[PDB]
């Protein structure tokens, strides 16, 4: 029949599920003492992401720790509340699942599914670049994820290989919703990663979901070339390159890839793919995606081009090593009012 009507039906039901959780968020579903801390998997501005073991079940999880005082100093209160409120309400095959959340006197905690394959960033840098079919397999998953998120009035705002984990089946799990926002109109916050910013963000204009479509163009280029389309030693030089209106493609890029990338890395919003009358369909029906079976991808039926090595449960060999700082919980509650809804 029409795949678009099945898509509409699917999205309508997903919105109903989302709104119930969006309106009544899960809160205080575990405690720190229920987890044994094993190893730091990564760090952020507010703290570490640690591999943990849930003692009652023996399950491994990734626990994100955010120091409330550091969130406040960085003026990230609202963004932190958006992050947990959004992540607890979403549900899609390529979005990392939030299993528990809670807080104590010092910190906020988000306990998520542990994705052991490591960041796409690690594999991309080591290998050098991904072949076109390899990059297309990952790109298809972001296209579907964005179609889902945007239907919920969500903007993701931080697409990059660092934020994409590879699961045991070789599929993507998107993490890091620190800048995600539920917004119907236009928004103005200067946020994201320099190499991935759309021109409208750099130029301090009101922007919308089209910034995630521009960031998809940067991701595809990076995966297929091994380097971003706009790079320099400092962010200001990156911004000058982004606003210039010029992109150079490697000679090995197929004609179809370049065409898709010119329509994604498009300064003109009345011309950027994902932003027109046909919406996501301009991307899904592009020639570069002709061999992509969208349903088979969503159903996880497609054989992945790369399966990460798995030594066993709790193995962290696909992640870099980090300095370990022991968690401290103050005897006094910090920033209680600011994080009341968490």
């Amino acid at each position: 029949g029409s795949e678009q009507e099945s898509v509409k039906e699917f999205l309508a039901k997903a919105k109903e599920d989302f709104l119930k959780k969006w309106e009544n968020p899960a809160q205080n579903t575990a405690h720190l003492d229920q987890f044994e801390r094993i190893k730091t998997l990564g760090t952020g501005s507010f703290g570490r992401v640690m591999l943990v073991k849930h003692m009652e079940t023996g399950n491994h999880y990734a626990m994100k720790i955010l120091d409330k005082q550091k969130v406040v100093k960085l003026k990230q209160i609202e963004h932190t509340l958006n992050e947990k409120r959004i992540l607890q309400a979403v549900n899609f095959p390529f979005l990392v699942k939030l299993e528990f959340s809670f807080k104590d006197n010092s910190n906020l905690y988000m306990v998520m599914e542990y994705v052991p394959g490591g960041e796409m960033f690690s594999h991309l840098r080591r290998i050098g670049r991904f072949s076109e079919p390899h990059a297309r397999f990952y790109a298809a998953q972001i296209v579907l994820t964005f179609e889902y998120l945007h239907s919920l009035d969500l903007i993701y705002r931080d697409l990059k290989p660092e934020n994409l984990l590879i699961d045991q089946q070789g599929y993507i799990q998107v993490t890091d919703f620190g800048f995600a926002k539920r917004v119907k109109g236009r928004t103005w916050t200067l946020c994201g990663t320099p190499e991935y910013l759309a021109p409208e963000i750099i130029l301090s204009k009101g922007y919308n979901k089209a910034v995630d479509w521009w960031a998809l163009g940067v991701l595809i280029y990076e995966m297929a070339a091994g380097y971003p389309p706009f790079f320099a030693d400092q962010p200001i030089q990156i911004y000058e390159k982004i606003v210039s209106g010029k992109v150079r493609f490697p000679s090995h890029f197929s004609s179809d890839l370049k065409d898709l990338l010119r329509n994604l890395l498009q300064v003109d919003l009345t011309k950027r793919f994902g932003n027109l009358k046909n919406g996501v369909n301009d991307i899904k029906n592009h020639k570069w995606f002709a061999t992509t079976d969208w349903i088979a991808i969503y159903q996880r039926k497609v054989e992945a081009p790369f399966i990460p090595k798995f030594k066993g449960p709790g193995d962290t060999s696909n992640f870099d090593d980090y300095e370990e700082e022991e968690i401290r919980v103050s005897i006094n509650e910090k920033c209680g009012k600011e994080f009341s809804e968490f």
């Binding site: 990663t193 320099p194 190499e195 091994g226 971003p228 790079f231």
Partner: peptide
């Protein structure tokens, strides 16, 4: 080459958000 220019740049490591 552009690859050599990228590899010699200070931005091949993990990138932080603004």
């Amino acid at each position: 080459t552009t690859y050599a220019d990228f590899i010699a740049s200070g931005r091949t490591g993990r990138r932080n958000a603004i």
